[PDB]
Scaffold this motif. Structure first.
Motif, mmCIF file in Angstrom:
data_model
loop_
_atom_site.group_PDB
_atom_site.id
_atom_site.type_symbol
_atom_site.label_atom_id
_atom_site.label_comp_id
_atom_site.label_asym_id
_atom_site.label_seq_id
_atom_site.Cartn_x
_atom_site.Cartn_y
_atom_site.Cartn_z
ATOM 1 N N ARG A 183 0.831 -1.184 0.000
ATOM 2 C CA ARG A 183 0.000 0.000 0.000
ATOM 3 C C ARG A 183 0.880 1.254 0.000
ATOM 4 N NH1 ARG A 183 -1.462 1.990 5.105
ATOM 5 N NH2 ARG A 183 -3.670 2.205 4.455
ATOM 6 N N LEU A 184 0.299 2.382 -0.428
ATOM 7 C CA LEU A 184 0.986 3.653 -0.443
ATOM 8 C C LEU A 184 0.708 4.383 0.866
ATOM 9 C CD1 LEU A 184 0.014 4.784 -4.020
ATOM 10 C CD2 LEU A 184 2.068 3.578 -3.319
ATOM 11 N N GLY A 185 1.409 5.493 1.070
ATOM 12 C CA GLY A 185 1.049 6.432 2.115
ATOM 13 C C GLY A 185 2.257 6.792 2.970
ATOM 14 N N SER A 186 1.946 7.539 4.034
ATOM 15 C CA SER A 186 2.932 8.066 4.969
ATOM 16 C C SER A 186 2.638 7.654 6.412
ATOM 17 C CB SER A 186 3.025 9.572 4.856
ATOM 18 O OG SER A 186 1.775 10.195 5.094
ATOM 19 N N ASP A 187 1.718 6.706 6.625
ATOM 20 C CA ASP A 187 1.343 6.301 7.971
ATOM 21 C C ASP A 187 2.312 5.279 8.564
ATOM 22 O OD1 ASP A 187 0.535 3.756 6.790
ATOM 23 O OD2 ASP A 187 -1.600 4.142 7.129
ATOM 24 N N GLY A 188 3.301 4.850 7.781
ATOM 25 C CA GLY A 188 4.294 3.870 8.210
ATOM 26 C C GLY A 188 3.974 2.401 7.920
ATOM 27 N N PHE A 189 2.760 2.145 7.411
ATOM 28 C CA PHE A 189 2.311 0.805 7.078
ATOM 29 C C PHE A 189 2.209 0.678 5.554
ATOM 30 C CE2 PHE A 189 -1.908 -1.630 6.957
ATOM 31 C CZ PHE A 189 -1.287 -2.820 6.637
ATOM 32 N N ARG A 190 3.327 0.300 4.928
ATOM 33 C CA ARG A 190 3.325 0.150 3.473
ATOM 34 C C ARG A 190 3.241 -1.316 3.065
ATOM 35 N NH1 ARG A 190 6.192 4.271 0.537
ATOM 36 N NH2 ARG A 190 5.241 3.150 -1.222
ATOM 37 N N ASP A 191 3.499 -2.233 4.004
ATOM 38 C CA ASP A 191 3.453 -3.640 3.703
ATOM 39 C C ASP A 191 3.124 -4.425 4.977
ATOM 40 O OD1 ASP A 191 6.079 -3.712 4.707
ATOM 41 O OD2 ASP A 191 7.048 -3.994 2.798
ATOM 42 N N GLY A 192 2.806 -5.693 4.730
ATOM 43 C CA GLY A 192 2.331 -6.613 5.747
ATOM 44 C C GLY A 192 1.728 -7.843 5.103
ATOM 45 N N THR A 193 1.107 -8.671 5.932
ATOM 46 C CA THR A 193 0.638 -9.972 5.512
ATOM 47 C C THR A 193 -0.735 -10.217 6.115
ATOM 48 O OG1 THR A 193 2.932 -10.721 5.518
ATOM 49 C CG2 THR A 193 1.241 -12.445 5.305
ATOM 50 N N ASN A 252 3.912 -4.445 9.079
ATOM 51 C CA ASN A 252 5.333 -4.098 9.072
ATOM 52 C C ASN A 252 5.457 -2.587 9.214
ATOM 53 O OD1 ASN A 252 8.204 -4.767 8.798
ATOM 54 N ND2 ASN A 252 8.071 -4.017 6.677
ATOM 55 N N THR A 253 6.356 -2.089 10.091
ATOM 56 C CA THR A 253 6.572 -0.648 10.131
ATOM 57 C C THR A 253 8.023 -0.359 10.501
ATOM 58 O OG1 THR A 253 5.602 1.472 10.751
ATOM 59 C CG2 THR A 253 5.814 -0.118 12.522
ATOM 60 N N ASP A 254 8.279 0.898 10.881
ATOM 61 C CA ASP A 254 9.636 1.318 11.242
ATOM 62 C C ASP A 254 9.571 2.278 12.422
ATOM 63 O OD1 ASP A 254 9.883 4.202 10.188
ATOM 64 O OD2 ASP A 254 9.210 3.139 8.335
ATOM 65 N N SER A 255 10.773 2.678 12.881
ATOM 66 C CA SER A 255 10.914 3.446 14.110
ATOM 67 C C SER A 255 10.437 4.900 14.017
ATOM 68 C CB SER A 255 12.338 3.397 14.599
ATOM 69 O OG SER A 255 13.211 3.750 13.543
ATOM 70 N N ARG A 256 10.068 5.404 12.828
ATOM 71 C CA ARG A 256 9.465 6.728 12.795
ATOM 72 C C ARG A 256 8.045 6.698 13.373
ATOM 73 N NH1 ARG A 256 9.983 7.602 6.458
ATOM 74 N NH2 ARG A 256 9.484 5.364 6.691
ATOM 75 N N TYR A 257 7.477 5.492 13.550
ATOM 76 C CA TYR A 257 6.085 5.337 13.940
ATOM 77 C C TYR A 257 5.953 4.688 15.316
ATOM 78 C CZ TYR A 257 5.790 6.642 9.145
ATOM 79 O OH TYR A 257 5.922 7.315 7.946
ATOM 80 N N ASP A 258 6.805 5.091 16.271
ATOM 81 C CA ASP A 258 6.880 4.458 17.583
ATOM 82 C C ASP A 258 5.819 4.937 18.567
ATOM 83 O OD1 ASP A 258 9.220 3.026 16.982
ATOM 84 O OD2 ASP A 258 10.533 4.275 18.257
ATOM 85 N N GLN A 259 5.096 5.999 18.250
ATOM 86 C CA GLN A 259 4.083 6.494 19.171
ATOM 87 C C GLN A 259 2.900 5.538 19.138
ATOM 88 O OE1 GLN A 259 6.214 8.729 20.829
ATOM 89 N NE2 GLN A 259 4.134 9.451 21.274
ATOM 90 N N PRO A 260 2.359 5.140 20.300
ATOM 91 C CA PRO A 260 1.101 4.406 20.288
ATOM 92 C C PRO A 260 0.032 4.977 19.348
ATOM 93 C CG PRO A 260 1.998 4.468 22.535
ATOM 94 C CD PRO A 260 2.955 5.263 21.646
#
Length: 259
Positions: A32-42, A88-96
């Motif tokens: 998926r596209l976007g800036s929410d930190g969730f671009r992939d997963g299963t 799947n995400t990364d450390s830019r998205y660490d806030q609950p």
């Protein structure tokens, strides 16, 4: 059953401990596209269509943010009869709050997917997560009425008051957690879940923050039971929740509460 959402065999203690339940699992990637930190997963889901639609469970990843930290949960929980989305995400998205955003997106992604969407009962949603992902699960539960169950794993959150959650919530802490100590995170959350349909606290004896990132029979069996009970309204799983495990070396449980 009177209950239309019952799936799978009548359970036993042995059953809910299995690496895989009754259902063969298929999987489908997410891109998926976007800036929410969730671009992939299963997405993991029962192949079998014979039994009806399933609830959908979205899982926020752990402290270090990769899907690999929660991957073992995906096929394992799905095999009991759930659609399960691992983020799947990364450390830019660490806030609950950032993790909550992603959980809503993951639920919606599965609901809207041409393959998996038709297998979901959109009225029956759930969230889980590790660490700040567990904090995000609480926040998502407060925000989305269709979430019927939450299972935060060793949750981290500076927000302590969870009166806004109606979803049945099982908080799983780790006795020796040095990142999100139970005394300042998990147990205050349990104590403030005063409007949850049911609340439970289950503490893993002699474990720390990262226990949820490896296959864990305790986490799995009580996650399965809780999701079954509150996502499926499946009364067959009450037997494992109440009275629940006793505490001590032989159960690997250092605390168990229901309220």
């Amino acid at each position: 059953a009177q209950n239309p959402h019952e799936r799978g065999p009548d359970p036993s203690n042995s059953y809910i401990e299995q690496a895989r339940g009754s259902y063969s699992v298929s999987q489908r990637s997410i891109s998926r596209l976007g800036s929410d930190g969730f671009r992939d997963g299963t997405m993991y889901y029962p192949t079998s269509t014979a039994d009806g639609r399933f609830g959908v469970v979205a899982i926020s990843p752990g402290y270090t943010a990769s899907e690999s930290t929660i991957a073992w949960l995906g096929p394992r929980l799905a095999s009991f009869g759930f659609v399960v989305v691992t983020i799947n995400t990364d450390s830019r998205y660490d806030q609950p709050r950032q993790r909550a955003t992603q959980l809503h997106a993951a639920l919606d992604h599965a609901i809207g997917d041409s393959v998996v969407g038709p297998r979901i009962d959109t009225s029956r949603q759930a969230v889980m997560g590790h660490s700040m992902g567990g904090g995000g699960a609480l926040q998502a539960a407060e925000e989305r009425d269709e979430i019927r169950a939450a299972v935060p794993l060793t949750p981290w959150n500076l927000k302590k008051g969870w009166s806004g959650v109606d979803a049945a919530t099982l908080v799983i802490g780790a006795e020796n957690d040095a990142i999100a100590p139970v005394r300042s995170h998990s147990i205050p959350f349990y104590e403030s879940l005063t409007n949850a349909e049911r609340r439970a606290y289950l503490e893993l004896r002699r474990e720390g923050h990262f226990a949820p990132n490896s296959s864990n029979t305790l986490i799995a069996k009580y996650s399965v039971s809780w999701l079954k009970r509150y996502v499926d309204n499946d009364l067959r799983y009450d037997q494992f929740i109440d009275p629940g495990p006793r505490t001590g070396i032989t159960t690997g449980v250092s605390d168990y509460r229901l309220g």
